[PDB]
């Protein structure tokens, strides 16, 4: 049922990681009602009003040594440290795709239940690869550390014909292929 | 780039509601149960490969609260603008008849972190099997959320994911049938 | 296993 004016504050600390942990950036962020208002960015090394609402938070935070010294070490003591704790089950999580094919005249390659997001999926007709009119719903994040996507091929089959779906993913050293015949 | 671990907090003023959670490429590692004051890992295993002592995070929320009340005043009691979610719904795996499978309700791109979610097997609410993620951050600062309902697929049943938000004027129902 | 670390909220300045 009914209700009234809402007021919201967010604090997010983002650790961003390039090339292992060779380059690291911390982004500290405050949001009031969908308006970022002040931040700390380790590559800037001090707080900035993002808007005038945040102006006095910057001035005050910047006036404090330990706050500043802490954030400026965060890149090592907080980001790098937690990369280290999470690495083996996050950076190195491998869950292998499950594939199927079918018609819904159109064609479906369903790729599901897999993890990390990057994936490539190509369509094959007797061996020769098919570029034209691959429809691809794009990549979908399931909420539970597994992804899925669907790739369609618009082709009316003829009899004989062997359409094959190739799938490639860093959890399998070899490509996963799954064929269909009319 | 390559990776991103977000420590995400909110506190939501009148509802007196809060969250402390860790993100990794937009996947919850764990959150804290404010009621219970204990770590809740997103998947069991995480708890066997890391631990987490939660005392600091609990205080963080209290500070986020005090902080919110000051902003509320400084901002001249400017309230947030409701932003309706985009509710898609699709299945876990290839829905083959009479084989255990799961339905996902994606609640994306919405603000204030408040939603009633209800599933509807033929138009009759069902809460046996359900679980759900908590509120997940996004770059724009809106929120992501996920609800699951596991089931046996049939030729018979319609399902709807019924989400309620102050963006929408009426609950968004999204139909899933086995086509 | 090993402990995940946090960073603590900076308090905004008082009214």
């Amino acid at each position: 049922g009914d209700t009234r004016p809402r007021f919201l504050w967010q604090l997010k600390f983002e650790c961003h990681f390039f090339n292992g942990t060779e380059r690291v950036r911390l982004l500290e962020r405050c949001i009031y009602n969908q308006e970022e208002s002040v931040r700390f960015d380790s590559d800037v090394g001090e707080y900035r009003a993002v808007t005038e609402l945040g102006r006095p938070d910057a001035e005050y935070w910047n006036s404090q040594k330990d706050l500043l010294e802490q954030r400026r070490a965060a890149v090592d003591t907080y980001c790098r440290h937690n990369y280290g704790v999470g690495e083996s089950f996050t950076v190195q999580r491998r869950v292998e795709p499950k594939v199927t094919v079918y018609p819904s005249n159109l064609l479906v390659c369903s790729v599901s239940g897999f993890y990390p997001g990057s994936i490539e999926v190509r369509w094959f007709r007797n061996g020769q690869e098919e570029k034209a009119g691959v429809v691809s719903t794009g990549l979908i994040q399931n909420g539970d550390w597994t992804f899925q996507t669907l790739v369609m091929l618009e082709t009316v089959p003829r009899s004989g014909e062997v359409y094959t779906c190739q799938v490639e993913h860093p959890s399998v050293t070899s490509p996963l292929t799954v064929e269909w015949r009319a | 780039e390559e990776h991103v671990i977000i420590q995400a907090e909110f506190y939501l003023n009148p509802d007196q509601s809060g969250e402390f959670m860790f993100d990794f490429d937009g996947d919850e590692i764990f959150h804290v149960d404010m009621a219970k004051k204990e770590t809740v890992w997103r998947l069991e295993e995480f708890g066997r490969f890391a631990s987490f002592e939660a005392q600091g995070a609990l205080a963080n929320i209290a500070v986020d609260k005090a902080n919110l009340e000051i902003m509320t005043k400084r901002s001249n009691y400017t309230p947030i603008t409701n932003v309706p979610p985009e509710v898609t719904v699709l299945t876990n795996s290839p829905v083959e008849l009479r084989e255990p499978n799961v339905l996902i309700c994606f609640i994306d791109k919405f603000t204030p972190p408040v939603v009633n979610v209800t599933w509807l097997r033929n138009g009759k609410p069902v809460t046996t099997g359900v679980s759900e993620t908590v509120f997940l951050p996004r770059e724009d600062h809106l929120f992501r959320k996920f609800h699951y309902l596991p089931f046996l697929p049939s030729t018979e049943d319609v399902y709807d994911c019924r989400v309620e938000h102050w963006g929408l004027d009426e609950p968004l129902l999204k139909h899933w049938e086995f086509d | 296993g090993e402990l995940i670390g946090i960073l603590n909220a900076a308090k905004v300045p008082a009214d």
Epitope: - | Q55, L58, A62, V63 | -
Partner: T-cell receptor, first 110, second 108 residues
Framework: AGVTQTPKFRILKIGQSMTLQCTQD?????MYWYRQDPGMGLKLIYY???????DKGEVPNGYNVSRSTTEDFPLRLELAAPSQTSVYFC?????????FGEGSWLTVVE | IQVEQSPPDLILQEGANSTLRCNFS?????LQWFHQNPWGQLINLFY???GTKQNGRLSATTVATERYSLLYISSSQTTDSGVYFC???????????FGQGTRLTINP
């Protein structure tokens, strides 16, 4: 002013009881009580991450503590046992530096 | 867990330099150094999470990514006598936590 704790000095009868005050004006949310036996390490008794939150240290027994306000962390000894003759120290910090009060030398007697 | 102070005792003639040392578990961080003078007052010397800070006769380096800090002391004075503790915070828990110390004696 940093951290200020009082009785710098107390004599406390066996079985009697007592409260050390510890007060800090720097807005620290994190505060802690330690005891230190002479020539020894600081051992943590109790600590508090903010208002209304507290947690047992490595030796919380025979002691008790409250935090209704950011500024104060009193520490209560209920039932003075002789094993509680020690030096007690209050500290606060938050983003960085640790600050210690001038200490409290408690001796418990028969 | 823990904080492991290198030398458990150190005795030097005034004017000498001192290196004190502290290694610490991946469970704690944000490393500080204190001086406990011999009337037991607990002085803070540095907050020193990472890198170098210097303060008159004292400087400290923390190699955050390797879990050790060095406290150096030029031209030590007899008054620097007492015990030195490296302290640190448990990650998440916010427990301030202490090595065993180093007794320092500076002889006139």
């Amino acid at each position: 002013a940093g951290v200020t704790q009082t009785p710098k000095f107390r004599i406390l009868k066996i079985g009697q009881s007592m409260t050390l005050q510890c007060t800090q004006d720097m807005n620290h949310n994190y505060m802690y009580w330690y005891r230190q036996d002479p020539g020894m390490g600081l051992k943590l008794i109790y600590y508090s991450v903010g208002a209304g939150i507290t947690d047992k240290g490595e030796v919380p027994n025979g002691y008790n503590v409250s935090r209704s306000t950011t500024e104060d962390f009193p520490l209560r000894l209920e039932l003075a046992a002789p094993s509680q003759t020690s030096v007690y120290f209050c500290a606060s910090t938050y983003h960085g530096t640790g600050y210690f009060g001038e200490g409290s030398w408690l001796t418990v007697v028969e | 867990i823990q904080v492991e102070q290198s030398p458990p005792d150190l005795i030097l003639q005034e004017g000498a330099n001192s290196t004190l040392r502290c290694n610490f578990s991946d469970s704690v961080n944000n490393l500080q150094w204190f001086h406990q003078n011999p009337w037991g007052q607990l002085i803070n010397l540095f907050y020193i999470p990472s890198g170098t800070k210097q303060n008159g006769r004292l400087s400290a380096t923390t190699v955050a990514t390797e879990r050790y800090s060095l406290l150096y002391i030029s031209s030590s004075q007899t008054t620097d006598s007492g015990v030195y503790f490296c302290a640190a915070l448990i990650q998440g828990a916010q427990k301030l936590v202490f090595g065993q110390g180093t007794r320092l004696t500076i002889n006139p």
